[PDB]
Design a protein around this ligand. Sequence first.
Ligand code: MG
Ligand code: MG
Ligand code: MG
Ligand code: ZN
Ligand code: ZN
Lengths: 39, 146, 38, 174, 94, 97, 99, 177, 160
Amino acid sequence: GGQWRLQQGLAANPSGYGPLTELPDWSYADGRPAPPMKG
Amino acid sequence: FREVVETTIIEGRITATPKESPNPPNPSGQCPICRWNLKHKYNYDDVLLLSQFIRPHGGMLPRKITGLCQEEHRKIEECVKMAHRAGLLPNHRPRQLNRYLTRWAPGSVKPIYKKGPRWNRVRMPVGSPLLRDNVCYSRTPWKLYH
Amino acid sequence: FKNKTVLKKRCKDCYLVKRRGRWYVYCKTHPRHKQRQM
Amino acid sequence: HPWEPGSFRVGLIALKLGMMPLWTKDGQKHVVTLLQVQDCHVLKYTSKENCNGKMATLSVGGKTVSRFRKATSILEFYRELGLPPKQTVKIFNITDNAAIKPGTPLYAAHFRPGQYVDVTAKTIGKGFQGVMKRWGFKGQPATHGQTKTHRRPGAVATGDIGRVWPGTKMPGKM
Amino acid sequence: MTGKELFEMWKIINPMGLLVEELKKRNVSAPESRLTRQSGGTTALPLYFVGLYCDKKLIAEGPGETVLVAEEEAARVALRKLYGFTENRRPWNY
Amino acid sequence: TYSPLPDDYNCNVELALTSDGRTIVCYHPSVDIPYEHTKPIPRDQVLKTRLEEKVEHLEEGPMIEQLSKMFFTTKHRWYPHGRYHRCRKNLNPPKDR
Amino acid sequence: VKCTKARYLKKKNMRTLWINRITAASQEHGLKYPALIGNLVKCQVELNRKVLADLAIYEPKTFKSLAALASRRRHEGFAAALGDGKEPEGIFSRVVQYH
Amino acid sequence: SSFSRAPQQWATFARIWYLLDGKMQPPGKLAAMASIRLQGLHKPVYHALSDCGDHVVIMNTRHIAFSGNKWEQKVYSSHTGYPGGFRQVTAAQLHLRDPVAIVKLAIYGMLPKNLHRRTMMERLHLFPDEYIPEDILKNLVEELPQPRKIPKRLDEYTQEEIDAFPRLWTPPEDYRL
Amino acid sequence: SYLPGYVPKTSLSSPPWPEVVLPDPVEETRHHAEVVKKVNEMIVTGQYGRLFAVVHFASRQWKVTSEDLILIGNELDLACGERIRLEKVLLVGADNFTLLGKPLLGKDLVRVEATVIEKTESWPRIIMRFRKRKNFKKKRIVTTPQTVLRINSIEIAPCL
Ligand SMILES: [Mg+2]
Ligand SMILES: [Mg+2]
Ligand SMILES: [Mg+2]
Ligand SMILES: [Zn+2]
Ligand SMILES: [Zn+2]
């Protein structure tokens, strides 16, 4: 669905510049922010 | 219509005739098909149309009488041939292998004993090239050669 | 009949007829004009 | 039942006794084979529905052999028909109007003179035989230089097909 | 007792009798076994889905190679549903 | 009057959107078989009833043809294998769930 | 060497297996695989083929809900294409925007 | 589903009998929807090593319909491996000798060219007419829908359909017709 | 009176697929509100058990349920036995309902909690290259670091 994602401006690969790839994967259960991911 | 009776006395009588249905949706059209908006929307199945344009014993009616354009008339002729071969006209008959979309006369094709290379392959024709411009209602075109 | 790629009517009585999937020239007055399509 | 056109009757099993001259009134010698009917008894009938095939059948058996040298199932079959064991049983495809009750004696006069018959038997076995006796091959010349090659097949095939075709006439049991 | 089924831990003999005893002790009509789904039958590998109905309302269903192993199974499914020890039940809170 | 899919074979799917539009809610309760759609469950005077214990031994050919017809397979499944493969097989296989 | 290259081949064959199972489940719901995949992406559902085959096998009511969602998205696309003007977008055809 | 381990496997990997009808139906479309189900490609638990095929029973294989001129143009080639044993028979000649051969050959050509093919072909059953054996008839679940819709001959149209279709042209009232 | 455009009923006059009328948006919006209210009340009452979720983690999508073990193909900078919150939940589902993110569900709506229980290595992987007749042959053995995490709880909250 790359052309549709480009038509909505949301990259073409869903692993590109969105919240699904750029938000942190996890956090401590108490609520502390995790260290930033390397990628 | 008109009939001729032989008893030796032969006489011609005029019988009742059908008329065109009252209001065509496109009155500016030139042949009966164009008028009734049927330019590319009829197949070999449409015997309720082919029956209107055939003779009682299976033959076609001539163009100067049906009013059909040459394109339509040839398309109707091929559709009627294919309907007769498929067996969809059981009461328009002269004087077991089930078929459909039969282009050629079944007694006049020879078997493909030597199919060629996959680049010059003897294909089997299916349907009629005259109905290429029929409406697809699909995203792959018609396959005229199998 | 004679096998021919181009069929030609050699009389006014020659008639072109397509039978058995092939065109043919038949003549009932001059049968030497019989021709078979190849 | 009476003979209707297009029917087919049973046949017999006969012992080949031998050969004899027979002269016809024109003065023509006509060698004949003597087939003696020993103890032909019809032994079984099978209907068209049971016999998966287009005709019914009637098993017929010939010479009387020894019970002591037969098998229990074959010996049990002959016990229920009340007949001594036979050597060979043959199946004769018959129409339904020609059914003869199992256990019935068949005789030489089932056939009549001036008639035409078909005779089937196993041929005389010649053992492993070469190409000259088994298939009429011409062989190779006797003299004129020939090495150990006089009754052998020549080429068995061609070089392009890297094999031997099935059914190639080669030496074997005759 | 984490990923184990009830009758893998608690061994029972006759689940239809246990099921009709529990239904009787809670004022419910006895379960009628009815053939819900069937594949094969003449074969050596049949599939039978037998459903247990109570007042023409389906309470359970079970599969098996025989109609009788399906009815035993359907009784076991009904017993698991009534006792609350089912597969889709809420997991333990640790 | 609109159903995206027919509602009579697995579940009764109802699709909805939240008011923010951020999440899709699907409600899918199971569809139960109707009783009207089910079927009912299918149903020596003097001597003892001796058990009819006969087992005819079939030779390898007829037995394999009988098994092939029973299970709708071919014969090669039922022919044996040799010692190399037989000792190659793992007789203590890994089991998960 | 075969072990080293069979890593690439394992990835390809596992994706082909997931696509085959998803095709089977979509055809059980009367849908085709390109329709399900494209219209879920249009619904902004970014489930991959591994978990879609997993839902086809172990959560069939969830999979029927997803096939219904893709069917609705396809019907809304068809309605928009035929309308061609400025009818409202369609309830499931709205796109949540991120900044 | 709260089933026990053994009945759950049995239910998941159980074998299903599907009924398909010929009668005015393209052989290769019958063969496509037959080979999918013989492979098990319609189950989402499919795997080439899970023996997940299903039984397919095809009826009225004598009444299949070929499109075009395939009845005289298609040729089934075979060779009895003796010299001179190359035989070529048209589709009509094979239909006249064996009424299930055409559908059988199309299904066989569509199955995967592996050693699981003849096992699937043993789970296929083909019958030339409406007769199916009683044991097979008592093993069926689901008659699949037919690929072609059957065009409906002219004498089969109801008078409502005939007078609903408009008369397109008016004939001259003096033509002999 | 045939309207301008009437095509008589032939096989190729009308599209072969059925005509579908979608619901009107107003009554459908109200129906959507009712469905959301029903599923929310189901969450409030607690008419569910054994939730599953689809969770994005380490470039991968995992369908997880409670008490499960997943093997992550890298180290994660957490000590063994450490409880973390899986945070990018694409889907959460139950018997009788399912909640779908676009593409990510709310962190006010779902929590996934996992515990690091193992930080290990993989078994040796052999990378061998070989090209014929060109003396080319190379062998490397690698061992990827790995982290087993247990899914502990999947909890949903009434927020629809
Ligand atoms: Mg000599
Ligand atoms: Mg020498
Ligand atoms: Mg010598
Ligand atoms: Zn015109
Ligand atoms: Zn001439």
